[PDB]
Design a protein around this ligand. Structure first.
Ligand SMILES: CC(C)[C@@H]1NC[C@@H](O)[C@H](O)[C@@H]1O
Ligand SMILES: CC(C)[C@@H]1NC[C@@H](O)[C@H](O)[C@@H]1O
Ligand SMILES: CC(C)[C@@H]1NC[C@@H](O)[C@H](O)[C@@H]1O
Ligand SMILES: CC(C)[C@@H]1NC[C@@H](O)[C@H](O)[C@@H]1O
Lengths: 441, 441, 441, 441
C-alpha cells in the first residue's frame, strides 16, 4: 500500500515491463487531425523560438496558430474554411468514419511496439472518451464513440500495454489569447482552482475507467493542483502497482524521464529509466503537407531506436492519423519497416540492459551501440560495413567468443592494442539488414 | 514583455498619460440607482463607525442597508416598495430609458475630464456588461444592453481614456448577512475558491473585451486569488503597456495609490503617483435625498482639484446617475462649472509636475498652491484677494519675472525678507474667476 | 550534475555496489561504551513502551537513562562512578588505548562484510572526529585522535566501503529533559535554527573530510533544516555519484529503506532496495551485562542474512566495542563464524538478485530461500535435512540441471505434482555447513 | 514613514539625485588585489561558460580559481607564493601603504563621477570596515584601517554620493568547494540561517555606520533572509529617504535595475531607471596582466556613457586598485580623459532625460544619440563628421533653432523628406572633441 506522500511514493519504481518494453507507439489524434495542416518549418531546437509559434510545424497546434491572425494557419484557414468557421466546428467533422481499432492494434503489434499511448485530451481540450466533466468529447460530438476505451480494448486484446496522454498543463478552452512566444507559457494557462479540479477529476476518471499502464501528462501540472498528485499517484498505484507515471508533472515523483532532441537527450548512460519521443515526421498530429522528405526513413528509425536503447531508454514513436481514422501510408510503411527489422533483431533489443558503455565507432567512422542480456553482449552497427576487416576503436574484449548474431556463426577477432579487430565474412555481412549485429559472450 | 512575478511587474511604472491627465470622472451606476435613496448622514471619517452602516449615506449600499431590518432604508423600502419586493427586482426596473452614451462622453469632455471609469460590478454583484459568468447582468436584465462597452466606445470616440471599476473584494450575491460594523468586513466576504475564480475570470474578461486603460479594483482582492494577479497583471500589461492598476488589490504591485478624506490624503509632496476620489455629494450612487447643501460647490471642486494636483495627485470625481440614465442637474451644473474653470486655467493643471513645495498662504490667510512646467511655476490662489498688495508668507523667488497668468501681464514683486510681495492691479484681479493665478519664470 | 530539488535528486538511484554488497557492519562506539551498561530487558517491539525508557536495553542511551533518577542506570551510576560524576566526564575516560583500526578492518573483512558504518555522533552529541563545530570530540578529549578518519583509512585499505552514521534527529547537548515515553520524542528535540545549522555543517564536514559511501542519518532531520537537504544531497552526489543516503531524513528522497524487526521488515519481495539492521545482542553500544543468552548464534546470523538477502535487502549487523577499543570475544566469535560460512557460500549471496519468490519450505518444514544470478538459481535451506529424499512444497522447476552447490554434483530431481522431489546423497549433505545449498540452471 | 511590506516599500521610487547623476565609479578592491592576477580571457557572454571558471578573467575571483587545482591561477599561485600560502594570508599582505582616500576622491570627481561605490565585502568574505561580526577585516588585518569609512569621508568631502557594494549572495568563508560551472551556483552557497543573520547584520551595520546613498547587493540575497529585507529596506529608507537599492536581492522591491553587456542591456527606452556597469578592462579587481589592448579607450568610454544615458541609464564604471592602494596609470588616464570630455559636454549629459527616441544615424552611418532638458534637445554624434553637410536619416525637427553646442552658433538646417540636413562649418567641427554636439530648441 502506497501512502499519499512523496517519500512513500518513492517506493514505487519503474515497473519491469516498461523497462523491458523498449518501444511504444504515441498517437496524437483529435479534431485538429481534420484540417491536418501545418507549415513543415523544421525540428524543435533548430527553428528560432521568436518565430516558432508563428510558423508552427505541429499540426496539433492548429487552434493556437489560428488564434494568431495572419499566421500561415490563419490564411490557410480563412481561404479553406472561411472566417465564419470556428475551430470547435471541427469536432463535428471528426467522424473517424474509417476507424477500426483492431486494425490499429494489429499494425502497432506488427511494428514491434509493446505499449500504445493515445492523446486522451490535447491542448485544445477536446476529450476522446465519454467524460462526464465536459460535453466537448468524442461520445457527444463527431465520432459518437468512446475512442480511448475502444482502442484500449483492442490494444489489450493484441497483448500490448495501454497508457494515456493527458494535457494537464494546457487547455485552450480555458484561455483566449494564443501563445506567441515561449515566455507566454509562464502566464497564459487556465490558472483557476476550477481548472485544477477538472484536471484532477479527469485523470482520476481515466484511472477508474481504463486503469492505464502509463499516465503520460504534458506541459506540467496546474500549480494549484500539484498537491493533489500525492493522492492521485497513491490511488493509482494502489489499484495498479504495475502502472507508471512520466516526469511532466512538476512534482517530486516520476517513474521515468522523458526527452526530445532539444531536451534531456543523453550522450552516455544515465542512472534512471527514461523514454525518447519524437514523431515519424516534424508534427505530432497529422500534417497533409509533409512528404517523405520531412520524415525519418526506416533506417534512421532503427538507428534512433538502437541509440536510445543502448542508453537505457525506450522509444515512444508518434503516429499522426487522419480525421477519418486511417493511418497515412508514409507512416504505416515506416512502421512496418521498423517492425521487420525488430522481428529479426528483437532479441538484441527487448529485455536488454545497458552495458558498461553505450557507444563506439569503427576506424572508418561507423557508429556502434551496445546492449546486454546477462553474459551476452550485443554489438549493433548503425550501418553495415563493406569490407570484411573491421577495426573498432578503443575497445578490447575479455570474452572468449564473438558470433555473428543472425547466423550464430563464431567469428575470429583479436584485441590489437587499444582496438578490436573482427573478420566478418562478406556472406554474413550480406545477410544483415540495416545493421550488422554481433554477439559476444 | 512583463513576467508574472512581482519583481518583474515593478518595471511597469504609472504611464505618462495618467500622470498628466489630472482629472477623471468616476461613475457609480447600477440597479441601486433606481431606488436612488440614502440618509445623507455626513462624510466618511466624520460619521461614527458604530452607526455608519445603520444610516449609510452611500445610496449604492442600499442592498446591505436593506438587509439591516428597521434601518432607515428598510423602513423606506417597505413603505415604498413593500416587503414582497426583493432588491434583485430592481435589475428589471433598471432600464436606462434615457441613456445616451455620447451625451455622457460629451459632458465629461466639456467638464475637463481626461479619463472615465464606470462601476462594471459594484458590491451587489450586478454586472453592467454581457459577462458570460453570471446572468445577473445588463444584457440579460433591465437595460438589455452592454453598458460598459457602449460607454467605452463613446468615451474613446470623444478622445478620453477608459478605465473600469470592479468590486473584487465584495459581492453580496455570495453572502447573506449584511455588514453592520467595520469589523464585519474581516469575515463577511465570499471566502470561496469559487469566488476567487469568478473575480479572476471577470477581470480577465473585461481586459479581453474592452482592454481598459485602468483596472480600478475595490475592497481588496480575495485572499485565495491574490497569486492570480501576478498573471493577470502580466497578461494585461503585455497586451496594453500603457494600462495601469490602482492600489486596492492587497498585493505588492500597483501603479498609483488612492486616497479619500479619511485615508491616505497627503499634507505635502509624496514621492509616488496617487489619485484622490470623492463624490460631488456624500454618496457615490445617485441619492434623490441630496440637495445643494450636501454637495461641493463649483468653487470647492476647483480648490479640491488644485490642492490635489499641487500634491502630485489626480482627482477622480464621482457622478451618480439616475436609473433612467440621466445625470441630475445639480451634478451636471457642478461639472460644467469645473469644466469652465479648467478651460481658462487648464495650462496650469494638465501636464504639470509638483514644485519644491505644494503650498503657501498670504498674510491675510488665503491659501496658495503651486504647480510646474519646466521653468514656469504656477501660483494658484484658492480665492481672489481683494486688495492689490499681496504678501505671501515664507517665500522668496529667484525668478526674474512674475506674470498674471490669464492676461500674461508682467508684474512687480520683491522678496521682502522672508516674504514675497506682489502688486496685482485690481483690473487683473477682476479678470480672474475663482482663483487668482500667477505665472513665474 | 544533480540539482538541488527533489525531482532532480530522484535521478540518483541506489548505487550498484550497495545493491551487491549484501552485508555491512554497523559500529556503535562512543563515551557511553566506557560504562557500557544497560539492563538487557528484551527486543524492541517485544518490550512495553511505557517501561522501555526506564529499563532501556540500549547501552548507548546511558545518558538519557542516567537523567531518569531511580532508573536502574542511575542507581548503577551513583554506586559505580558517584553522584558527582557527570556523564560528559566519560569523554576523559574514553581513551581507546587498545584501539587498532587495521585490526578492526581486517576482522570486518574476514567477517565477510563489504561496508562499515561507525557512529560519528550518536544522541549524546559526542563527535568521533575533529569537527570544528564543537570541542566535545575525540580529538580534543579522550582518545586525542580522529577515530572516524583513522577508521576510514583502515576500512578502505582493507578494500571495504565506508559510510557514516550521524544522529541528526537527537542531540542531548541541546536538551536537558530525558525521553521517558515515545511521545516525548515529538517535542524534546533541539528545536532551534542553531541546531539545524549545526547538523547541516557537521554532515557537510563529514562529506568534505571523508567523502563517505553512505550517509546514514538517524531519528529524522530537524524540521527547520529539511530544506537544506536538497542542497546537501546534490553537493554530496555531485562529488560522489556512487554515494548513497538512507531513509531517516523525513524528506522525499532516499536511496534505500531501513528496517528493524518491529519496523518495515518485509514478508516477501518489495520493489525497492532496503537494509535490515540489528545488533549481535540486544544493545547497539557495548553492554557488559550481555552474555551468549542475549546474542544471536552463528547459525541464526546466517539464517538472518539469507532471509534478508532473498528478499532484496542488505544486512547491517551491529558491533558494540568497549571503551578501550577492543571488540568483545563473544561478538568477534560470531563475526568470524559468519565470515567462515560466507567464505564457503558467498557466491550464492554476493552480487545476487531476488528470484520470482523468496521463499518455500520442505514437507517437514525446513525453510528455504532463493537468490539468483542470471540463469543460476540458488536454493538455500535454512538447515541441513537429514534424509536424502527431499520434497519441496509448491515448487516446480523448469530448469534442467540441479546440482549440489558445494561439490557441483548433478542431482536427480522430479516435479511431482505441485512439489519438487530431489535426492541428495548423505555424503553431500555431510559436506555442507549450517545450510544445504543447491544450484539450479 | 515606510512600512515593512512590499506594497508600502513600492512607495519609494528612485531618488532624483541618482536619476540625474548619470555616472558613477565602482571600486573592486580587496585582498585579491595583492596577487592581482587572472588570465585575460574575454568578455562575459563571449566566453564559453564550460571554461569560464577554469580560466576566469576576473581577478577578484582569485580564491575560487585557486581552489580549482590545475587552473592557471593555481599554477601561478604555487610558483609565486607557494603551495603553503593559503588565500587568507593575503589579508596580511594587503597593507594599502600608499593609499590616500582624498586623492582617490579627487580623481573620481575630476573624472566627472557623481557617486562612488566600493566593494565592502566581495565573495571572499573579507570586510573593508571594522565590522563586529568577523575578525577577517581591514581593521584587524592588513591595513589596520577602516577603508570604507575613510573612503566615505573623502568621497563626501569631495561632494560626491557614496554607496556600498556587498556580496550578499556569496561568501567563500562559508563554503569549501569552488564554483566550476554556472549550475554550481544553485547550491554551493552558505545556505545556513547563520549566514542569513550575518548578511542582515552586516548590511544593517553598514547602514548604521555610514548611511550609504546606495545599497548595491550582488549575487542574490540568501533565501532564508529574503523576508528580512522588508525590514531592512524600511529601516534604511526611514533613516535616509534619498537612499536607494539595486535589483540583485531577489525580492519584489528595487529602485533601479542593473545591466551588463550580456544582461538587461536595452536596445531602446525602458520605462524604469537602470544602470550599466562594466570595468575599464576585462576584470573588476586589479589584473596586472591587462594592458591597453584589454581596456576601453577614452573614445569608447564616451560613446558608452552617451549610449547608456540616451537610454535612461547611469554608467557605473569600475576601477580596480592595486594592493598598495594606488590606481594603475592606464585606468587613471582613461578616467581623466573621460573627465575632460564631461567638463566640455556635461550639460548635454548630467540632469538630462530621455527624448522620444534614443537613436539615429547619418547617411554614412555615424551613430547619433539624443538627451533632453525641457525644451533643449541635445544631438550627440558618436564621432565627428568630416564634411560640413550632414544628413540625418529618419528624423524631422519641429524645432526652430539648431545650434552648435560648444560655440552656440546658429546653424542652417532643413527637413528634407524623412531626413534632416544640417550644415556645420568645418571650423565648428574642428572645435569639437570626440563628439560633435548640436542643440535644438
Ligand atoms: C512531445 C510531444 C508529447 C509534444 N509535447 C508538447 C506539445 O505541445 C506537443 O503538441 C506534443 O504533444
Ligand atoms: C471610494 C469609492 C470607490 C467607494 N469605495 C468603497 C465602496 O464601499 C463605496 O461604495 C465606493 O465604491
Ligand atoms: C537502529 C539503530 C541505529 C538505533 N537507532 C535508534 C537509536 O535511538 C538507537 O540508539 C540505535 O542507534
Ligand atoms: C558586475 C560586477 C559587480 C560583478 N558581479 C558578479 C561578481 O561575481 C563579479 O566578481 C563582479 O563583482
Amino acid at each position: 500500500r502506497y501512502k499519499p506522500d512523496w517519500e512513500s511514493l518513492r517506493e514505487h519504481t519503474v515497473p519491469k515491463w516498461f523497462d523491458k518494453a523498449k518501444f511504444g507507439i504515441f498517437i496524437h489524434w483529435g479534431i485538429y487531425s481534420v484540417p491536418g495542416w501545418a507549415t513543415p518549418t523544421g525540428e524543435l531546437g533548430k527553428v528560432p523560438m521568436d518565430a516558432w509559434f508563428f510558423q508552427n510545424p505541429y499540426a496539433e497546434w492548429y487552434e493556437n496558430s489560428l488564434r494568431i491572425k495572419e499566421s500561415p494557419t490563419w490564411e490557410y484557414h480563412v481561404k479553406t474554411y472561411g472566417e465564419n468557421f470556428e475551430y470547435e466546428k471541427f469536432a463535428d467533422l471528426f467522424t473517424a468514419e474509417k476507424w477500426d481499432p483492431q486494425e490499429w492494434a494489429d499494425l502497432f503489434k506488427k511494428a514491434g511496439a509493446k505499449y500504445v499511448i493515445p492523446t486522451t485530451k490535447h491542448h485544445d481540450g477536446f476529450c476522446l472518451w465519454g467524460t462526464k466533466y465536459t460535453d466537448f468529447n468524442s461520445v457527444k460530438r463527431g465520432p459518437k464513440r468512446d475512442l480511448v476505451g475502444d482502442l484500449a480494448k483492442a490494444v489489450r486484446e493484441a497483448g500490448l500495454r495501454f497508457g494515456v496522454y493527458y494535457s494537464g498543463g494546457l487547455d485552450w478552452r480555458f484561455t483566449t489569447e494564443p501563445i506567441r512566444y515561449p515566455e507566454d507559457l509562464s502566464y497564459i494557462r487556465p490558472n483557476t482552482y476550477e481548472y485544477a479540479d477538472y484536471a484532477y477529476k479527469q485523470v482520476m476518471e481515466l484511472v477508474d475507467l481504463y486503469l492505464p499502464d502509463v499516465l503520460w501528462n504534458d506541459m506540467g501540472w496546474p500549480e494549484k493542483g500539484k498537491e493533489d498528485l500525492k493522492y492521485l499517484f497513491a490511488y493509482y498505484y494502489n489499484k495498479h502497482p504495475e502502472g507508471s507515471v512520466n516526469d511532466r508533472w512538476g512534482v517530486p515523483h516520476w517513474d521515468f524521464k522523458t526527452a526530445e532532441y532539444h531536451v534531456n537527450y543523453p550522450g552516455d548512460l544515465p542512472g534512471y529509466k527514461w523514454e525518447f519521443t519524437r514523431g515519424i515526421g516534424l508534427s505530432f498530429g497529422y500534417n497533409r503537407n509533409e512528404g517523405p522528405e520531412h520524415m525519418l526513413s526506416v533506417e534512421q528509425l532503427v538507428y534512433t531506436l538502437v541509440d536510445v536503447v543502448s542508453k537505457g531508454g525506450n522509444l515512444l514513436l508518434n503516429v499522426g492519423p487522419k480525421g477519418d481514422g486511417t493511418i497515412p501510408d508514409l507512416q504505416k510503411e515506416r512502421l512496418l519497416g521498423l517492425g521487420e527489422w525488430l522481428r529479426k533483431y528483437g532479441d538484441a533489443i527487448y529485455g536488454t540492459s545497458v552495458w558498461e558503455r553505450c557507444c563506439a565507432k569503427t576506424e572508418d567512422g561507423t557508429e556502434i551501440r551496445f546492449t546486454r542480456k546477462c553474459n551476452r553482449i550485443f554489438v549493433i552497427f548503425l550501418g553495415i560495413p563493406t569490407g570484411e576487416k573491421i577495426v573498432i576503436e578503443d575497445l578490447n574484449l575479455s570474452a572468449g567468443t564473438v558470433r555473428h548474431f543472425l547466423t550464430g556463426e563464431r567469428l575470429s577477432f583479436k584485441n590489437v592494442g587499444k582496438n578490436l579487430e573482427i573478420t566478418v565474412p562478406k556472406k554474413l555481412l550480406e545477410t544483415d539488414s540495416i545493421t550488422l549485429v554481433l554477439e559476444a559472450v
